[PDB]
Design a protein around this ligand. Structure first.
Ligand SMILES: CNC(=O)C1(Cc2ccccc2F)CC1
Ligand SMILES: CNC(=O)C1(Cc2ccccc2F)CC1
Ligand SMILES: [Zn+2]
Ligand SMILES: [Zn+2]
Ligand SMILES: [Zn+2]
Length: 457
């Protein structure tokens, strides 16, 4: 129960229009052989080109939808979920017809640039009809598991010019994809074609009829099945960037913003709606803290009418509501909100289904599409740093800080002390880290930082 057995059956029905006469009885072992690959009883970490659904989910950062549409004398259109379309000749980025020896070079360049900061491998996500599997021998080479010639990462590319192997970071000028993975979505038990199944859940990807459109719809449908309709928050993903800093920044911003709203507007009660594991972000606040459980929505954003109504203080209008990563359709006017913006471009955020995005930071979270109208009763929360801690350096070099948003006793009394200048700059860094990761902060309209200066009287 580790890898997908080569002796597992492969339903070949989807393959019979490009490959008429294909045997109904078929295994992975016979399919790989038919694709032109020899596995030679090799016990070297590459037991099968095809992988299980569970392995595909653990390597979601490696997913690249691939589709081949025909144009012996058949020129092929090679579509990738990066939006790239290459034309191979036997001899929405649309490239003219070229022979395989140059096409394979462009393929290694594209996958290397797309994946070097995401994953140690490639997973071709297919809706297999025939031509994509038969085309693989023209750009893929297989063998035992290898390491890069320039480093210790696993080898993902091969060069017939130098006879060496490279990872995605060192494969400049390499021509073959080495030991790729693949999964046929059509093997999951679907009725109807790709578009009919895709269009049931997503109105964002259309069918222009080019190979890359299908490659996009395939990866999208695969993401919906594995992360929208089925959610598994137990699967851990490796650290590939600023994960730890972003998470630390998020907890610092939360404490700061909630601590200041309770000081400025002195709400008697706070309704904390979201994560059933949540802890009081401001443990020393006077306020009555009431929790309401709601797991992260992955399909559509929660309707505020279902979260609140149907008969808890019952009066959510009393006090303030804290929606920290709790994605609802329209926030009530008395709210403190942290909403992830799915449009953000990063190595942590991968494209999702129906405008949503798959945010992968320790765990995978499909987030519904960012909608500006959710925030009509609120305003954008401005940057501010508040601190009531004593001015005492205790224990890096200095330049005097001058800022209208440093809300401290020292700034009230004229000059900012070294301690609050160091802490203000660290907090500004954490804030910029969090904003740039895609998170966006919103607050009730009466929120004024001018009300914080009187907490120094
Ligand atoms: C167009 N057909 C092919 O090139 C063949 C190999 C082949 C490749 C992939 C899957 C099944 C298969 F049978 C029959 C030779
Ligand atoms: C550019 N075309 C090719 O290299 C051919 C083989 C071929 C490979 C994959 C799918 C269908 C196919 F017909 C026609 C020779
Ligand atoms: Zn390397
Ligand atoms: Zn889609
Ligand atoms: Zn100070």
């Amino acid at each position: 129960p580790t890898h997908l057995s080569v002796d597992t059956k492969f339903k070949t029905e989807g393959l019979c229009v490009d490959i008429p006469g294909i045997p109904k009885d078929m295994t992975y072992r016979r399919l790989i052989s038919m694709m032109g690959f020899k596995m030679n009883y090799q016990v070297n970490g590459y037991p099968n080109m095809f992988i299980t659904r569970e392995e595909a989910i653990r390597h979601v950062r490696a997913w690249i939808g691939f589709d081949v549409e025909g144009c012996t004398n058949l020129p092929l259109q090679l579509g990738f979920s990066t939006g790239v379309n290459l034309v191979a000749v036997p001899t929405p980025l649309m490239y003219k017809g070229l022979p395989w020896n140059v096409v394979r070079i462009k393929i290694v360049q594209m996958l290397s640039d797309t994946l070097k900061n995401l994953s140690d491998r490639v997973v071709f996500v297919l809706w297999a009809h025939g031509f994509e599997l038969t085309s693989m021998k023209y750009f893929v080479k297989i063998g035992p598991e290898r390491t890069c010639c320039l480093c210790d990462r696993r080898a993902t590319c091969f060069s017939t010019a130098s006879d060496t192997y490279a990872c995605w970071h060192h494969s400049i000028g390499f021509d073959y994809v080495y030991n790729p993975f693949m999964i046929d979505v059509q093997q999951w038990g679907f009725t109807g074609n790709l578009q009919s199944n895709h269009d049931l859940y997503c109105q964002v990807h259309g069918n222009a009829h080019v190979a890359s459109c299908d490659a996009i719809m395939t990866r999208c449908l695969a993401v919906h099945e594995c992360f929208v309709k089925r959610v598994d928050w137990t699967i851990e993903y490796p650290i590939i960037g600023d994960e730890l800093k972003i998470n630390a920044a998020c907890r610092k911003v939360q404490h700061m913003v909630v601590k200041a709203a309770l000081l400025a507007d002195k709400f008697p009660v706070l309704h904390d709606i979201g994560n059933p594991k949540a802890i009081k972000c401001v443990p020393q606040a006077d306020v009555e803290w009431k929790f309401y459980d709601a797991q992260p929505c992955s399909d559509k954003a929660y309707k505020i009418e279902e979260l609140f109504y149907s008969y808890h203080s019952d009066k959510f209008t009393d006090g303030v509501c804290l929606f920290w990563n709790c994605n609802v359709d329209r926030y009530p006017a008395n709210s403190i909100v942290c909403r992830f913006d799915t449009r953000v471009l990063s190595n942590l955020n991968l494209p999702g289904c129906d405008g949503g995005s798959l945010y992968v930071n320790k765990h995978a979270f499909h987030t519904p599409a960012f909608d500006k109208s959710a925030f009509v009763n609120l305003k954008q929360l401005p940057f501010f740093y508040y601190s009531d801690s004593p001015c005492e350096s205790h224990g890096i070099d200095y330049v005097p800080l001058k800022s209208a948003t440093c809300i401290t006793r020292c700034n009230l009394g004229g000059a900012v002390c070294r301690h609050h200048a160091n802490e203000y700059r660290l907090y500004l860094d954490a804030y910029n880290m969090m904003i740039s990761a895609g998170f966006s902060l919103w607050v009730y309209k009466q929120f004024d930082t001018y009300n914080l200066w009187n907490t120094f009287t």
